[PDB]
Write a protein that binds this ligand. Sequence first.
Ligand code: CU
Length: 124
Amino acid sequence: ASENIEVHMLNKGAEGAMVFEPAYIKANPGDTVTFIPVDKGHNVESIKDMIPEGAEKFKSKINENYVLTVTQPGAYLVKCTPHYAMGMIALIAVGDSPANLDQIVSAKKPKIVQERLEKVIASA
Ligand SMILES: [Cu+2]
């Protein structure tokens, strides 16, 4: 059956300011990821060219609880729209050996984002 993973959106966490906790989410097709705005001022949005081919773009409203159903295998880099430049991202890995992970790692993104992404992947 289907699993749900809860993610908190915070002003401050273990990795510093403006964080998703956890920032690495492992899931399977059909699972849900529930994004909880523990602190105000956050949302979640897919990043262009950093979700699998065939997955639908998504953008939640600031300060709303948002439930994402993941269907397409692969890796997804998501941001908090206001805080992307401050490093507020999460990586969702759906299925084994996501085919687009190396592409996401090599994609153009802000330096602080890339540093956090590298730490996330190492914590895998
Ligand atoms: Cu934010």
